[PDB]
C-alpha cells in the first residue's frame, strides 16, 4: 500500500524520493531553525502521513548532515497511527550553531516492517 | 508471534503497549538511576525476553523524553537469541541532571523484521 | 538472500556473523583512528555490499561500545543499491579520546527490511 500525506500547511514540502530502491523518503524542514551547539531542536515538516499497514516510520539521519555537521534524529519513532505533525528531533553535537532553512531536506522516513506481538507474561524462559 | 518475558526480580514492571498499533512495548526501569548532564547509564528492566522469530528487538526512543529532556537510546540491537536482563543504555546530553524512578518508562522494545542473509565475497560487484 | 561483498582493498576484513540468529554482521576498521573526546570520525570498512532485495543496510552500534565506552553510530541508512565504500560514522560522547585500531569491530550491519511505497498526497486525512 501507499505512503499517504497532507500538507497542514504551505510551508510544507511534499516528500521525495529521487532512487526507486532508496531506503526512505526525504523530509523537509516547513520552518527556518538555528541550533546551537550542543543543543536540540523540533524541526516542524508541517506534514502528517498515514504508514502503510505493517511498518512504522522511522525518522532516520540523513547520511552527509551526520558525517560533514555531526547533526543526529532523535526520537524517530512514528507510530503507524500517528496523524499529528511529523517533528524531526535534531540534535547539534557540532561546535557551531547549525542552521536549517525553510525547503532543506533535514531526515528521511523509512517504512520499516516490524511484528505487533501480543505479550505473554512466563516463569522463566 | 507472541513475544514472551519473564521478570527476573519483582522489582521488573511487565511492558505494556497501550495502543494496538503503537510500534514498541515500554520497557520500565526495575531502578533509580541519576545520570548527568553527558553521561551515559545502563539502567536494568529486570526482564528477559524472547523475541518472535524473524526479528531482532530494538530498544528505541520514547519520543518525549527526546524532544523534552534530550534523552538519547544508546546501543539498542537485542539479539532474537538473547535471555539475559534487558538493559536500556541512556546518553543525558542535557544540561541538567535527569532522573529515572524505578518504574519509569524509559524506552520502546520494537520487533523489527530483518532477513539472516548468508555472506558471499566476490572479486567487484 | 544472499549478502554480496567485495573488498576495496586489501585492508578490509570480510563482515562476519558468529552466532546464526545474530541481528547483525560484524564491520572492521580498515585504518587506525584516534576519536578525541565529543568527536566524531567515519571509519572506512573498504568493501562495498550488495544488499538482498527488500532490505536496507542499517550500520548499528555494537552494544558493548556504547555501554562500556560511550560510543554511538550516526548515519546509518546503506540504501539497498548503494555500491560505495560502507563508512561508519562514529561519534565519541566519552570524556576521553577512543583508539580504533585497523581490525577492531567498530559496528554492526542489520539487513532490516521495509516497504519502498508510493507516494500519494490528500488533501486531509
Ligand atoms: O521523531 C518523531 C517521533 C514520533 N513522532 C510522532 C509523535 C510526535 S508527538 O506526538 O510526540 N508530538 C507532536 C506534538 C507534540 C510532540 C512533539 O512535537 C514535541 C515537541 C516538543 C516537546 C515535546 C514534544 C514531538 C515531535 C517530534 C518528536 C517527539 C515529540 C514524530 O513526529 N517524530
Ligand atoms: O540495548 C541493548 C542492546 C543489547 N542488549 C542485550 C545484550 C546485553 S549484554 O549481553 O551486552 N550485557 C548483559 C551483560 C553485560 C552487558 C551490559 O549489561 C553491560 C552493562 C555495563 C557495561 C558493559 C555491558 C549491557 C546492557 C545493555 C546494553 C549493552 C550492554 C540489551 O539488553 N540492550
Ligand atoms: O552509515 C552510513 C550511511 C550510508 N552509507 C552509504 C553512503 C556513503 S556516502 O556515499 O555518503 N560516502 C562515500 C564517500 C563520501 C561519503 C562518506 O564517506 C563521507 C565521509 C566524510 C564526509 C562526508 C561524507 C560517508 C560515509 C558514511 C556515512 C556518511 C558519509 C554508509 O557508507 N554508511
Ligand atoms: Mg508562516
Ligand atoms: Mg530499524
Known amino acids: 500500500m501507499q505512503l499517504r500525506f497532507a500538507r497542514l500547511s ?3 514540502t511534499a516528500p521525495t524520493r529521487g532512487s526507486a530502491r532508496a ?3 526525504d523530509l523537509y524542514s516547513a520552518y527556518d531553525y538555528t541550533i546551537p551547539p550542543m ?3 523540533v524541526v516542524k515538516t508541517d506534514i502528517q502521513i498515514a504508514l502503510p499497514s505493517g511498518c512504522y516510520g522511522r525518522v532516520a539521519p540523513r547520511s552527509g548532515l551526520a558525517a560533514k ?3 543526529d534524529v ?3 519513532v ?3 497511527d500517528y496523524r499529528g505533525n ?3 528531533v535534531l540534535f547539534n553535537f557540532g561546535k557551531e550553531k547549525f542552521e536549517v532553512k525553510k525547503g532543506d531536506r533535514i531526515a528521511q522516513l523509512i517504512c520499516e516492517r516490524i ?3 501480543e505479550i505473554e507474561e512466563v516463569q522463566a524462559l
Open 74 to 76: 532523535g526520537a524517530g
Open 39 to 41: 543543543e536540540k531542536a
Open 23 to 25: 531506503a526512505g523518503y
Open 10 to 12: 504551505e510551508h510544507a
Open 69 to 71: 555537521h555531526f547533526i
Open 115 to 117: 511484528f505487533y506481538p
Open 86 to 88: 511529523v517533528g524531526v
Open 78 to 80: 512514528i507510530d503507524e
